[PDB]
């Protein structure tokens, strides 16, 4: 081949061009490094130049007859090997020398403009250096936004967008989709540092801000790797944005599939939306959607045919010759299939669109109409710049435009990966001209349902809640309401004191109020029924008063006892009356004086019912001799002799409990929840069983005496009515032991109301009713 | 000023103008800077020793800032009449100057040595810090006489160590510097246990100029999120010509009481130390390089009108960086001296290539003002830095040393004492979460480690702080522990003892009702001959006696330690005898109405049924159903003892045989009850038209006897009274079993000892009748 020959051709004024056409597989001497291995698409890009040119001269329109030039170079992607030839651009016409001037309009420049390089890297390197002569330059493939700046690069264009429409856009279809709490990523180049600044701003800007700002390391020959994901998943976010390069994606992915990780939405940049590499990851399928922007612009039709034909002719021997009458000695030895790889890469066209706008300003400095134009001194490089700002200049029919800032403006297509067996398709789903338009009913996410993934966070917390400050630039609040066991005294302070001892307050409560004494009141719908029934318990034990007291020297009554029948009648109404001391507010003196002043009397009166029982047992079982002496005796002064025993053995029992635990009042707090308990305590049944003695053994010893005597044969029988009165009390007071001890406690105290009221209405209805109903009839039974 | 005719030449690149160069304001540092050259050059000159005859020049030239770039490198570079041949090999180009001392920005470090790297020219820098300038690929010919950022990181997180600081804030600016800081301090805080509340970018502005509405929203946001974080330690990585606004919004405000760590960039700075107002926000640290004394060089200096100004400041400071240019102009005259082979009093000329001085340079060692003055691999000389205080009064400088840091070690030393704004002049505080007490694990908040809550145990779980302090471990085997307790107490069990006074009770009870069956088993043996021995039965009286003595005999194993083999008698053994005990009864009773009212009733078969299958059988076919129930109840349930839990308090537990529970006490309680209604029923039916031998008159009694203690002790376990369960149920076994000792044969006892009215054999006779 003859192709390394073509890179130099003679006009009236000539370009420049860089291209990466070489590479490279230490420094002791200042010599320039050489590079020998062969790279396509440098050669590629060089023989789209070369087509333009070639294009353009051909043309009447555009420069009529004037003739163009090029002169073709390689950077090797090393800014020591690319200075080099930048160096020999500015430099006398004709000589080998550079001068040394205090600023330009002293040089003679033998280049007009220059096709600046692919890499942003050597990009900010010649631009500082061109823009010192103000050479216009033009790049095809360097984005980065720092390269926008005309304070530092005031003579730089490029026809390519720059990163920050893609992130701009990224951002609104964020907004629009309603993502709020987020998570972005970017690689360890100037790439991924240079998005992140851009993005962090253009959220914070917009409402969205991020929980994790981190970066992925590069593959430079994997443990920092493993902390990355651990913040990414310990933040619960469902959306992540990755802004790296290939390998710096493909490394994660890999690491993400090795192990497990639940699907996510990631938001992807143009260098791994498009990459064989990263689609072609087995596993791949179980990581989530996968969105991204695509820019949209013309292909070259003719390149393929055009280069097929070049090399054609390359292969003639005869041209060679002719053509005689090396920057790539590299390139002279290839073959078809050494290029066929990219005959469609998709930047071709944007060399070609750089070629044309330098060319279209030269034809409006020239002032040039449509076949001839007038002849002057040769336009100066800086000339140029001039009408180059605001210039429409058609390409392929697509009119374009630079801007103030040097950049052109293209649209955009949203993409979106969809699964088809085992290959990835890429389908479209949305528009970015300049404001996202978005196709909602074509879209399969990764969920069980087919519906759009959330992940939010809350601005405000509610009125009744703490919140606490969540983010890396402390945007979102999570909110938590306390239980019902604290106030909220402040709204910054994040703690929930809890209530005061006396106060209740539910959960979410500003501040715990005040409670109220419970206590069974006066008024309780069951003291009344109780105090009802103590006015017929009180009724009917008169009565039998008002008739024993009336037939007092009757026959019938004077076996009862006459005047001992009316003491326990009397005494039993005390016991009743006693009934009231329990309800309402307790008091110190009322605590203290309800057991020992309810139970004194009974035993008062089981003296008189014992007295008759044991009665009927001297005659019943005992001997004639002793039966003849205890009648004789008991009928004497020694019936108020047991009852004034009875009477010292209770008091005396009850001064003994009395001191040994005596009931006091207590106050009980959180037995329910809005009421503060006061009531009198007990122990155990220690002072119930104590006070509960004499009467537990005075109505034995006069049931077992009186429950076996015969009953009298055609008569009414003395020993019925005691043995059927006495198991009366011992029913009562056993049946209410489970009650009273599994009952509601504020009731607790009108249980004890009971036993007695019934206890006394058993009594008065088995020994001293049968005595007054025969009365009531005596004067009719004769 | 700015010439001096030589042998050999040398570069700088100053900034004296910074804000044509000619149109800014002036900068005493250039100047200042530039005068530290001009004296190390004469210096250099006026010594015999260091090179004798070689003179040295130099070639000054402005920079203002990142403005002018370009024209001094190719100025310097140039043969003469200002052309530079181009070519592929620049071994023998002898270039005007032959070192560069260079400028003091990193950006304009690296445009430049991405130029003079063609050449490899030696450059030497003073001011630029960065990491990415220790690459060698990139810069093969770029060296540093101060030491990088990482050095600065390394002192501010040292200094965050020595008083505990683990919460605090990062403020950065917009540009390469803030943002390469900011993520390397980040980086390394994330391995030292120190957190970052959040971090945020100040909006980029100047002085002298109109601001947007947009902007000061902005800082207002920014200050209210300092005045609503719990940190109190700032961080700020921002360049001077920046803060001004940052600050009187701050004092617009009332936020009192942080430390601010300041970096290199406004560690010293005259313009805004002198607002005076500033004094009441906190302490004000700052780290700097160490300065050095140069003796002669304030003769050199004082001998234009901004230095004037400031030249009370410029003696107070700007010995801090002269020094840097001191080193590197003596450093490449000991590498010159070194590569042309001089010695002490003679000297040899030769063409010097600039390549040729870089392999020299790369390998100096000698020792200035006390400062061994060496190069390692990465192009850097190792100077202390220090930390400063500002300080207020005139009357002492305005920035006083407080630490040193040495950066061969990484470590901070010798550390001073500081004045704080604190009321009795304490350490300031900042940390996120309170420590937590004894006994108490710990329970996450967020995304941050040091923040979290201090959780106390429950009872029956221990927190080893030398284990997992997030969870305490259950307390395991027979050790036990409540609230807040690290250390268990394993726990007790008790038995029916010896000195307890119930155990004594039931002892005296039960032994008076075994010594009255004893003397009533002699009584009811010699006197075989009398009717009332015989009316019993005969001989199965006897058998009724003796079973109640082992009953009693069984009262012993009751007390002592529980285990398998006493708890199967107290299962077995001891209710076996029970139940045919009242159903001797019962079928007594059945003796006393059936035999003769069913024999009078139903003559027809009754006379000839029961004439064969005596009672005896029937009271068999009772006990065969006692056994049968009893080896069901066995199966059913097992002999392995049961422990239990004392409400009263942790540290007792209780331990007794299977059948404790009264669900499986009234297992055996359901016969025996059915067995001892029939008999009453029975007994009650002849209590007294007949008189046989006056029988149901005890059997009555006897039976009351048994059911009073029987509902007794149902009433009051349904209430529980603590450890009094095995109690109760010995003082009614012993006397439900005394109802049976003196209520059905200690009546019979007194008739055969005190009234022969039934012994007579006439007497009974005719009663027997009747």
Same mark, same amino acid.
């Given at each position: 081949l003859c192709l390394s020959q073509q890179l130099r051709m003679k006009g009236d004024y000539v370009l420049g061009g860089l291209f990466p056409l070489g590479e490279a597989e230490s420094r002791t001497r200042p010599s320039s490094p050489v590079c020998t291995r062969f790279s396509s698409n440098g050669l590629l890009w060089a023989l789209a130049m070369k087509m333009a040119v070639e294009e353009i001269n051909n043309k009447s329109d555009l420069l009529p007859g004037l003739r163009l030039g090029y002169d073709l170079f390689d950077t090797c992607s090393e800014p020591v090997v690319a200075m080099k030839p930048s160096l020999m651009f500015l430099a006398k016409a004709g000589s080998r020398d550079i001068a040394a001037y205090?600023?330009?309009?002293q040089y003679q420049p033998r280049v007009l403009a220059v096709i600046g390089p692919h890499s942003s890297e050597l990009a900010m390197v010649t631009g500082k250096f061109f823009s010192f002569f103000l050479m216009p330059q033009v790049s095809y493939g360097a984005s980065m936004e720092? %390269?926008?700046?005309?304070?530092?690069?005031?003579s730089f264009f490029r026809t390519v967008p720059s990163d920050r429409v893609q992130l701009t856009a990224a951002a609104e279809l964020l907004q629009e989709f309603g993502w709020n709490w987020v998570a972005a990523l970017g690689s360890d180049d100037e790439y991924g540092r240079q998005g992140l600044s851009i993005f962090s701003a253009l959220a914070a800007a917009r409402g969205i801000c991020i929980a994790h700002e981190g970066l992925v390391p590069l593959p430079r020959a994997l443990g920092k790797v493993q902390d990355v994901l651990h913040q990414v998943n310990q933040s619960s976010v469902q959306v992540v944005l990755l802004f790296a390069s290939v390998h710096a994606a493909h490394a994660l992915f890999n690491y993400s599939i090795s192990s497990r990780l639940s699907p996510k939405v990631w938001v992807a940049s143009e260098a791994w939306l498009t990459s064989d590499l990263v689609m072609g990851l087995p596993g791949m399928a179980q990581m989530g959607t996968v969105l991204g922007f695509l820019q949209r612009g013309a292909q070259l039709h003719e390149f393929p045919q055009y280069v097929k034909t070049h090399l054609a002719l390359a292969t003639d021997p005869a041209f060679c010759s002719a053509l005689g009458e090396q920057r790539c000695p590299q390139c002279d030895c290839i073959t078809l299939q050494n290029v066929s790889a990219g005959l469609n890469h998709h930047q071709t066209f944007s060399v070609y669109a750089a070629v044309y706008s330098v060319a279209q300003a030269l034809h409006n400095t020239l002032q040039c109409n449509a076949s001839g134009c007038p002849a002057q001194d040769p336009v100066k490089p800086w000339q140029l710049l001039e009408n180059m700002y605001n210039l429409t200049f058609h390409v392929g029919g697509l009119p374009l435009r630079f801007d103030s800032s040097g950049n052109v403006d293209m649209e955009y297509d949203l993409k979106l990966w969809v699964w088809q067996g085992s290959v990835p398709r890429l389908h479209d789903v949305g528009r970015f001209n300049g404001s996202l338009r978005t196709e909602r009913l074509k879209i399969r996410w990764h969920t069980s349902d087919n519906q759009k993934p959330v992940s939010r966070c809350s601005r405000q917390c509610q009125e009744g809640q703490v919140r606490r400050v969540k983010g890396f630039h402390s945007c979102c609040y999570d909110c938590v309401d306390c239980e019902a066991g604290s106030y909220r005294q402040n709204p910054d302070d994040i703690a929930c004191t809890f209530c005061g001892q006396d106060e209740w307050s539910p959960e979410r409560s500003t501040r715990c109020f005040r409670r109220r004494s419970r206590f069974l009141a006066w008024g309780e719908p069951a003291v009344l029924l109780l105090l009802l029934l103590l006015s017929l318990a009180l009724g009917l034990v008169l009565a039998a008063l008002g008739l024993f007291v009336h037939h007092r020297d009757s026959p019938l009554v004077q076996a009862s006892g006459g005047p001992l029948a009316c003491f326990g009648l009397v005494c039993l109404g005390l016991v009743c009356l006693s009934v009231?001391?329990?309800?309402g507010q307790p008091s110190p003196a009322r605590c203290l004086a309800q057991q020992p002043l309810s139970h004194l009397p009974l035993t008062g009166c089981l003296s008189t019912l014992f007295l008759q029982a044991a009665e009927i047992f001297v005659e019943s079982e005992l001997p004639l001799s002793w039966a003849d002496r205890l009648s004789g005796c008991l009928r004497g002064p020694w019936a108020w002799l047991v009852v004034l025993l009875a009477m010292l053995v209770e008091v005396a029992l009850c001064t003994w409990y009395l001191v040994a635990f005596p009931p006091e009042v207590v106050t009980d707090w959180?037995? %329910?929840?809005t009421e503060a308990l006061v009531h009198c305590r007990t122990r155990s049944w220690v002072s119930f069983g104590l006070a509960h003695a004499t009467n537990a053994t005075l109505a034995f010893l006069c049931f077992l005496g009186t429950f076996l005597v015969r009953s009298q044969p055609g008569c009414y029988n003395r020993a019925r009515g005691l043995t059927f009165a006495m198991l009366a009390y011992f029913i009562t007071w056993v049946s209410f032991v489970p009650l009273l001890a599994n009952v509601q406690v504020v009731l607790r105290p009108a249980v004890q109301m009971g036993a007695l009221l019934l206890c006394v209405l058993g009594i008065l209805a088995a020994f001293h009713l049968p005595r007054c109903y025969l009365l009531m009839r005596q004067p009719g039974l004769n | 000023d700015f010439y001096l005719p030589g042998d050999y030449l040398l570069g700088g690149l100053f900034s004296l103008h910074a804000n044509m160069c000619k149109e800014y304001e002036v900068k005493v540092i250039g100047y200042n800077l530039m005068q530290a050259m001009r004296f190390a050059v004469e210096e250099i000159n006026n010594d015999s020793s260091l090179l004798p005859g070689v003179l040295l020049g130099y070639e000054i030239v402005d920079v203002c800032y990142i403005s002018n770039n370009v024209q001094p490198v190719l100025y310097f570079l140039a $043969? &003469?009449?200002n052309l530079l041949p181009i070519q592929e090999d620049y071994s023998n180009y002898i270039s005007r100057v032959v070192a560069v001392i260079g400028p003091d920005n990193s950006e304009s470090v690296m445009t430049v040595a991405n130029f003079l790297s063609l050449f490899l020219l030696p450059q030497i820098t003073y001011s630029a810090i960065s990491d990415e300038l220790r690459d060698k690929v990139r810069f093969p010919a770029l060296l540093r006489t101060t030491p990088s950022a990482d050095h600065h990181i390394e002192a501010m997180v040292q200094l965050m160590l020595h008083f505990r600081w683990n919460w605090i804030i990062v403020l950065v600016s917009s540009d390469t510097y803030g943002r390469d800081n900011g993520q390397l301090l980040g980086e390394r805080v994330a391995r030292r246990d120190i957190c970052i509340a959040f971090q945020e970018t100040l909006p980029t502005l100047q002085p002298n100029q109109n601001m947007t509405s947009e902007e000061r929203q902005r800082l207002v946001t920014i200050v209210d999120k300092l005045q609503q974080s719990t940190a109190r330690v700032v961080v700020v990585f921002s360049p001077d010509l920046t803060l001004y606004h940052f600050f009187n919004e701050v004092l617009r405000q009332n936020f009192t009481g942080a430390v601010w760590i300041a970096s290199e960039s406004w560690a010293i700075d005259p313009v805004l130390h002198n607002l005076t107002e500033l004094r009441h926000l906190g302490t004000f640290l700052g780290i700097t390089i160490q300065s050095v004394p140069i003796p002669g060089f304030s003769e050199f200096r004082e001998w234009l009108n901004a230095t004037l100004s400031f030249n009370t400041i410029l003696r107070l400071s700007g010995e801090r960086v002269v020094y840097s240019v001191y080193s590197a102009v003596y450093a490449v005259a000991h590498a010159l001296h070194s590569l042309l082979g001089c010695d002490k009093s003679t000297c040899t000329k030769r063409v010097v290539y600039p390549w040729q001085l870089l392999e020299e340079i790369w390998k100096v060692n000698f020792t200035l003002l006390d400062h061994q003055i060496f190069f390692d691999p990465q192009g850097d000389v190792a100077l202390h830095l220090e930390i400063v205080q500002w300080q207020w009064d005139r009357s002492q400088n305005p920035f006083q040393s407080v630490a040193s840091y040495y950066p061969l070690q990484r470590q901070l030393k010798n550390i001073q004492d500081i004045s704080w704004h604190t009321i009795n002049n304490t350490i300031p505080m900042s940390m996120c979460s309170k420590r937590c007490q004894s006994g108490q694990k710990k329970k996450p908040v967020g995304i941050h480690v040091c923040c979290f809550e201090c959780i106390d145990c429950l009872p029956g779980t221990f927190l080893n702080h030398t284990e997992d302090e997030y969870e305490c471990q259950a307390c395991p085997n027979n050790e036990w522990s409540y609230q807040s307790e690290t250390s268990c107490f394993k726990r007790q069990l008790v038995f029916? &003892?010896? $000195?307890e006074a119930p155990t004594i009770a039931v002892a005296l009870l039960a032994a008076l009702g075994f010594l009255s069956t004893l003397a009533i088993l002699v009584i009811f043996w010699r006197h075989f001959q009398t009717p009332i021995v015989r009316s019993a039965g005969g001989p199965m009286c006897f058998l009724m006696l003796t079973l109640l003595l082992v009953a009693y005999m069984v009262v012993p194993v009751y007390v002592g330690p529980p285990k398998v083999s006493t708890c199967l008698c107290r299962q077995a053994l001891f209710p076996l005898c029970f139940t045919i005990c009242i159903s001797c009864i019962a079928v007594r009773s059945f003796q006393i109405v059936c035999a003769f009212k069913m024999a009078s009733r139903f003559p027809r078969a009754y006379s000839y049924w029961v004439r064969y299958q005596g009672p005896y059988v029937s009271m068999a076919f009772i006990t065969v159903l006692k056994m049968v129930i009893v080896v069901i109840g066995m199966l059913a349930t097992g002999l392995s003892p049961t422990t239990r839990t004392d409400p009263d308090d942790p540290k007792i537990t209780i331990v007794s045989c299977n059948p404790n529970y009264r669900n499986s006490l009234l297992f055996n309680t359901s016969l025996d009850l059915l067995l001892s209604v029939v008999g009453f029923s029975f007994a009650y039916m002849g209590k007294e038209l007949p008189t046989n031998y006056n029988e149901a008159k005890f059997i009555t009694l006897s039976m009351t006897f048994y059911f009073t203690s029987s509902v007794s002790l149902c009433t009051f376990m349904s209430a529980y009274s603590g450890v009094l369960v095995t109690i109760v149920d010995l003082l009614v076994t012993v006397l439900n079993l005394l109802a049976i000792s003196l209520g059905y044969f200690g009546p019979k006892c007194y008739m055969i000892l005190f009234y022969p009215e039934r012994n007579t054999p006439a007497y009974f006779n005719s009663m027997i009748q009747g």
């Open positions: 205090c600023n330009y309009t720092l %390269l926008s700046a005309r304070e530092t690069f005031p009231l001391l329990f309800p959180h037995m %329910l929840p | $043969h &003469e009449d029916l &003892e010896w $000195h």
